[PDB]
Each structure stands twice: as structure tokens, then as C-alpha cells.
Amino acid sequence: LSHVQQALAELAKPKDDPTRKHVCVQVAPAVRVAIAETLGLAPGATTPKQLAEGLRRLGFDEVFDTLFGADLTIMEAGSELLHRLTEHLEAEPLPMFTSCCPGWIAMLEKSYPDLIPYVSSCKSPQMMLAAMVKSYLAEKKGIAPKDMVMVSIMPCTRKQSEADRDWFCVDADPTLRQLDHVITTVELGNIFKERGINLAELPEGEWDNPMGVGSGAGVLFGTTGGVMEAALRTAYELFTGTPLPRLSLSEVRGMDGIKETNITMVPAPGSKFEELLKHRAGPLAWDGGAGFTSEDGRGGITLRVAVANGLGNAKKLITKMQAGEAKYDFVEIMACPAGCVGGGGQPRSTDKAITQKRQAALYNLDEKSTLRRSHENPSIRELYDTYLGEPLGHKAHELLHTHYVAGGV
Numbered sequence: 001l002s003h004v005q006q007a008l009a010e011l012a013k014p015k016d017d018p019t020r021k022h023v024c025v026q027v028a029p030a031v032r033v034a035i036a037e038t039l040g041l042a043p044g045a046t047t048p049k050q051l052a053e054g055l056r057r058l059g060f061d062e063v064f065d066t067l068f069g070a071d072l073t074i075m076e077a078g079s080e081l082l083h084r085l086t087e088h089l090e091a092e093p094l095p096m097f098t099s100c101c102p103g104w105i106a107m108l109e110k111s112y113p114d115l116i117p118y119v120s121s122c123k124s125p126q127m128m129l130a131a132m133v134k135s136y137l138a139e140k141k142g143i144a145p146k147d148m149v150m151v152s153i154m155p156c157t158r159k160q161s162e163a164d165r166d167w168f169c170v171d172a173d174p175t176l177r178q179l180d181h182v183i184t185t186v187e188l189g190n191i192f193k194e195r196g197i198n199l200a201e202l203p204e205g206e207w208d209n210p211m212g213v214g215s216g217a218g219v220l221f222g223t224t225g226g227v228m229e230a231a232l233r234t235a236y237e238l239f240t241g242t243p244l245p246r247l248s249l250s251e252v253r254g255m256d257g258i259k260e261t262n263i264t265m266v267p268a269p270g271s272k273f274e275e276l277l278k279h280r281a282g283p284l285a286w287d288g289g290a291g292f293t294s295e296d297g298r299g300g301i302t303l304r305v306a307v308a309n310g311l312g313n314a315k316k317l318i319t320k321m322q323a324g325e326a327k328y329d330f331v332e333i334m335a336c337p338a339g340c341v342g343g344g345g346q347p348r349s350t351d352k353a354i355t356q357k358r359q360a361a362l363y364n365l366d367e368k369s370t371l372r373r374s375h376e377n378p379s380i381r382e383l384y385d386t387y388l389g390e391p392l393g394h395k396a397h398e399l400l401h402t403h404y405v406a407g408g409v
């Protein structure tokens with residue numbers, strides 16, 4: 001009856017049982033780093049492939065990395081940000097708010113419904129991957145979507161409410177969910193312990209590529225800095241023709257839980273963006289944007305970015321934004337004070353710095369030194385080229401975008 005119980009019941013069916021479904025799991029990075037703590041070990045003390053092996057030992061037919069879903073979110077959100085910028089340069093409002101945290105989306109709908117048009121229409125990484133699995137991958141494997149079960153392992157006690165939004169379903173049948181069951185880090189750790197599975201003693205397993213062909217997880221080596229940063233990078237690099245380094249946000253004096261950075265953007269020589277800047281020179285009192293110019297006319301825009309952690313802190317930021325005392329163009333609100341590594345589904349620790357330890361072990365040092373870019377991922381390129389079309393296009397909109405409901409759902 002619980003979602004854990006339903007998922008385990010699907011796995012309990014022998015693989016050759018005529019009523020067996022194709023049971024898929026996707027795993028968030030915050031889960032991978034914290035799951036070792038369920039054994040009393042340090043964050044990161046078990047490897048990603050040990051976790052993949054453990055999941056395969058529970059009976060999962062596919063084991064996916066949610067980072068594949070995040071590459072889709074980066075493609076869509078980066079394009080969406082650049083589109084809003086483009087529309088505003090040529091005279092879907094700015095500022096844009098990210099949409100990946102369901103705690104934020106719940107507060108948005110209930111308490112700030114007038115802000116709905118400013119929020120990204122992107123689904124979350126877990127929902128984009130789920131939508132893809134029950135469309136593209138089902139078709140590829142010749143499996144009816146109703147015979148697919150999608151489970152996510154999340155650090156978050158709110159991701160089931162996200163998955164349960166009614167229209168996240170296949171062909172307007174609300175009982176055919178894109179994402180069926182969410183299991184938290186601690187629930188999964190309990191499942192392993194109840195079965196005598198010790199992740200730390202497992203051999204390395206393998207990931208499956210959600211494209212259904214090829215080796216590995218379908219995500220390239222390296223790190224992005226997360227969906228918000230990589231969406232910014234996508235827009236910035238197209239706008240300027242120059243690389244965006246890893247960001248370092250600074251604390252905002254006088255506002256708890258708020259960090260910021262300003263990103264100066266000069267359009268690439270000969271680009272449409274350069275043309276737009278030169279030729280064409282609501283609830284949130286947006287100031288028409290920050291810009292700069294030089295004596296010879298090489299002008300640019302300055303993108304003002306904020307991240308709010310904690311919903312109380314976000315409410316204070318929104319108050320200041322409405323007052324015009326805080327001026328931002330792109331804002332990420334996450335409900336958890338420490339972000340997802342400190343989510344409500346994570347192990348409890350006496351270590352006041354456990355979330356710092358989780359963040360540090362979240363990706364290895366070799367991968368942290370390497371910046372990767374979602375649009376360079378051959379699996380992502382193939383999916384757009386042969387199935388989705390263009391970011392923000394009709395098919396991408398259908399599978400990967402969503403809407404919001406004033407008053408909540």
C-alpha cells in the first residue's frame with residue numbers, strides 16, 4: 001500500500017512471471033553520496049557502481065542515473081532562459097525562477113500564485129527522465145508503457161508529491177504514471193539492511209543507458225555545477241561565444257540563506273544577440289535589466305543571479321524583490337537549508353557538518369576538475385535529433401514541460 005511496498009511487490013514477481021513488469025529505477029546523486037551512512041559509514045564510502053549492483057540485486061531491470069534527466073533539464077532550461085532573454089532584448093516574463101524543487105512549487109502555487117508566469121515550465125530531472133523512459137525507451141524496447149514501472153530514489157520527502165501531479169501521465173490516462181514510486185535514501189538503506197545486503201561489500205555493477213543501447217549511464221565524465229548553473233552556462237556560452245567557468249556564489253549581507261553572483265555578458269561578434277543589443281536599445285517590480293556599454297559601443301548585459309535555500313529565507317527574498325530592494329534576473333529556490341544533500345529523506349547524523357561532507361564527496365576529484373556540457377552528450381544529441389526535435393519544441397514541450405495551478409493541486 002505504501003509506495004515502497006508497491007515497488008517491492010513488483011520486484012517480488014519472478015522475472016518470468018506472466019504478470020511481471022519491466023521495473024526501472026533512477027538514482028539521484030544526493031542519494032549515492034549519503035547511502036553509505038545508512039551502514040554507519042562516511043558519505044561517499046560506497047561507490048556509485050556498488051549502489052547500481054545493490055539495486056540490480058533487488059531485481060530492477062534497469063538502473064539509471066538521474067543525471068541523464070538533469071542533462072534534459074539543462075537543455076530545456078538553458079534554452080528557456082535564452083529565449084526569455086532574447087524576447088526581452090527585442091522588446092514569459094523576467095525574472096525567471098527555477099522549478100526543480102517541489103517544496104518551492106507548492107509554496108508558489110499556494111502562497112504566491114501571482115508569480116506563476118515567472119516560473120520555468122521545465123519538469124524536474126526525475127520527471128524528464130521518467131517521461132522519456134515511458135515514451136522513447138518503451139517504444140524502443142517494444143514494451144507497452146503500462147508494463148513499465150518507474151521508481152526513483154531521492155533525498156527528498158516531497159518528490160512523490162511532484163510525481164503525483166495528475167497530468168504527469170501517459171496519453172491522458174492518469175492511472176498510467178510517468179513516475180510511479182519514490183523511495184528515499186533512508187527507505188532504500190532500510191530495504192538493503194532488511195535483506196542483508198551490505199553495499200560496501202558488493203562488487204562493482206553497471207548502469208543502464210536510458211537510450212537502451214550503449215554502455216554506461218549515458219552521461220559523460222565530469223560535472224556541471226547543477227541544473228541552475230548549467231542552464232546559465234548554456235545561455236551564456238551561446239550568447240557570448242565564451243566559456244562560463246564554475247560559479248562561486250557569494251553570501252548576501254543582511255539576508256539569510258541567499259547567495260548571488262553577477263554575470264557580465266557581451267554578445268558574440270556578428271551574432272543576433274549583438275544586433276538586438278545595438279539596434280533595439282507585474283508583481284515583481286522588474287527594472288528592465290542591468291546593462292553596460294563602452295565608448296566604442298561594445299555593450300553587454302549583466303545577469304543577476306540568486307539562490308535561496310530555505311522557504312522562510314525565500315519568502316524574505318521575494319518580499320525584497322517585490323519592494324525593488326533586491327534585483328535579480330534568475331533565481332533558484334530550494335526548500336532545504338542545505339539543498340538536496342540535506343533533504344528530508346537523508347540519514348540523520350550527529351555531525352553538524354554532515355551536509356558539507358556530503359557535498360565534498362558528491363563527485364570525485366577527477367570528475368570535479370572536468371566541466372561537462374549537456375549539449376555535447378551524444379546520447380542527448382541523439383534523443384533530440386531522432387525523437388524530441390528542438391528544445392522548447394512541441395514534442396519537448398509535451399514530454400518535458402509542465403504548468404502550475406494557482407491555489408495548488
Ligand code: SF4
Pocket residue numbers: 100101102103104155156157158159334335336339340341342343344
Ligand atoms: S531542496 Fe529539499 S525539498 Fe527541494 S528538491 Fe531538494 S531535497 Fe527536495
Ligand SMILES: [Cl-]
Pocket residue numbers: 066100124125126127
Ligand atoms: Cl529531480
Ligand code: NA
Pocket residue numbers: 206207208209214215216
Ligand atoms: Na550498461
